[PDB]
Structures are given as structure tokens and as C-alpha cells.
């Protein structure tokens, strides 16, 4: 890792705009770590389709992430490019359907289902690299540590931390992605409708699965990670909203972390944590900051480039159950 900035840009504690990358300019907040001497770990929150970035920050049922940093760890949480820059936009032209072959507006997480969506197959986007770029630019102020540089977030969020683990894996240590999308495809790349992605994970459920939210194909090999992917339980589903105001249902977490899972867990030098929960699809609501708390704490507990066989997963809070290796709760094993 190489601390450096877009020329002439001051960072700050709190929110930092106008942060020039690939044409677009950005926004970002950080929060720096409290009682801690030296390097700290980092925290990259990012949040959802129709929760604002305060939101996710501060906001209890959101998360209320900023406070990671009473925890020691220097938070630093990433504005949608929907929301103009703005950390207060909720949904307001972010809770949609994606352009210029993104499939979703709030992060650029996923190639889209036409034909668009091909120059994404194996460029990482404007999201992931923002994200490199800022956390590279915030560490010529602040001292952090570059083995313990994690991503996180819910939904669309936890579907753009798939896609930065799956494309930036020699940078990022690890990270949380929680109720994110995978967009599973054939094995051939082709896209599949909602039911057709859903029916495919349910008749393969051990399998690596292709997805519209990584490379095309997968890469063989990824660097050295630790992955906690987490699952809502039999209510972590979405309901799109028609133009019209109408809902259905557009998403099921089951085969996105479970398909993730599958992916982490193959990886020999990634250490995955396949944890549920009941509470949906909405930011960890039971013992929220414990979950927090104990989540990135274990995270940090293996640095990038820890040998997977030294890690040791220690009890999640009440309201979790929490393994090493693929999600196995979620679909019926084959003996």
C-alpha cells in the first residue's frame, strides 16, 4: 500500500467533497480511530439502497457505524455517486435500477442483465477503485494500518463489498458483506432472471456460482482475505418498487450468501465466516453494536497474509450462529 492523494486535495475528519477519480467527483466521511497509538485498523462502511450514509453512520437501527471508531478503528464511509454527494439522500434517485450497464443505481456493484452490462465482466468500476484511492488518500493523514484495511456494508452495500473483494483482493484485508447480491449466472456468463439465479443455487447448493457482481469468469485465485458474509434469515428478501409505487419481489439473500459462501470458503487463502441471523434484510438488529463490535474485531484478527489455519473464531453476540467455512443451514445437504 502507497499513501497518496489527487494532487492538492487536504483531507479532513468528518466529510471530505469534490475528491476527484474518473471523471466523477466524491464524497466521504471519516471518523479517526480514538485510543489508539499508531496504525489503526480501518472501516469502511458503506450502506444501502434507501438508508443515507449518516444514516449508516449514526443511526442505531442503520448500524450507527461511526461509532467503530470508540472502538478503535478509523471509519472511513464512502457517499453513493447517486446521491451527488450529498450524505443525507436516502432514496431520492439512488433506489433504482442501474445506467451505462451498472444492474443497480446506489453502487457501481454489479454489470447489468443486457448487453451493456459486458464491459463490466472484467473491470472493477468506478466504486471499487473510488474506494482504493480514498482509503490510499486518508492514510497520508491519519496512520493505518494496511494489513487491517476492511469494506463492509448492507444490500446494495453488502453486493458492492462482494464485488471490491472479488476485484481489489491484494488490497482490502477482508470485509463484511451483509444481504449481498451475487447475481448468480450460468456458468457460461448469461444472465438469469431472479427465479431462474434462485432455482439455480437451490439445485446446486454446494457449487461455485458464477455472478453478475465478480469478474466473468470468477478468478482462480484470490488474495489473502477474511470474509464474514452474513445472512438475515427466511426474511431477508427485497421488494423492488415499480414506478407506479407497486412492490415485489425482486431479491433473496439465501442464494447470495450462500453462493458467496460457497466461493470464500473454496478459496485457500481466504478464511470465510458464514454467519445468521433473523432479523431480515436490514442492518443486524439484534445486539447491534455487540455484532459490530465482535465482527470487526474478528476481522482484524487476521491480518492480510495470517495463515487460515491460526485463525480462531471466538463466540458471536446472542441473536447469531456463526461458522468457518460455506453457509450450511440454508439449503438441505445432498446425503
Known sequence: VKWECPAGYEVKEGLNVDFPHKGMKRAFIVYPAKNVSGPAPVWVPMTGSVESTNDNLTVARSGANSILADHGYTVIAPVRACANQDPNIRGERCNGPGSNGWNWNPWFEGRAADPSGEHWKNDEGPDSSFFVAM??????????????????????????????????????????????????????????????????????????????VGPYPLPAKVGPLIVMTVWGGEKDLWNCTRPDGSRFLCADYRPSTQ?????????????????????????????????????????????????????????????????????????????
Not at 470485509?175 to 456458468?187: A, C, F, K, R
Not at 438469469?192 to 437451490?202: E, T
Request: proline share 6%.
Open 135 to 212: 482509503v490510499q488518500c486518508v492514510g497520508t493523514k491519519y496512520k493505518l494500518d494496511a494489513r487491517r484495511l476492511f469494506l463492509g456494508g448492507i444490500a446494495s452495500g453488502g453486493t458492492m463489498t462482494n464485488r471490491a473483494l472479488l476485484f481489489r483482493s491484494n488490497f482490502w484485508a477482508g470485509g463484511l458483506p451483509i444481504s449481498g447480491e451475487w447475481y448468480v449466472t450460468s456458468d457460461d456468463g448469461t444472465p438469469l432472471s431472479f427465479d431462474d439465479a434462485r432455482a439455480a443455487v437451490a439445485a446446486a447448493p454446494t457449487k461455485i456460482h458464477q455472478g453478475r
Open 259 to 335: 453462493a458467496g459462501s460457497n466461493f470464500f470458503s473454496a478459496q485457500p487463502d481466504v478464511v470465510h465466516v458464514a454467519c445468521s441471523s433473523t432479523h431480515g434484510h436490514m442492518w443486524p438488529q439484534l445486539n447491534t453494536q455487540e455484532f459490530n463490535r465482535w465482527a470487526l474485531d474478528t476481522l482484524a484478527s487476521h491480518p492480510k497474509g495470517s495463515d487460515p489455519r491460526s485463525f480462531k473464531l471466538t463466540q458471536p453476540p446472542e441473536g447469531y450462529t456463526c461458522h468457518v467455512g460455506p453457509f450450511t443451514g440454508l439449503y438441505a445437504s445432498a446425503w
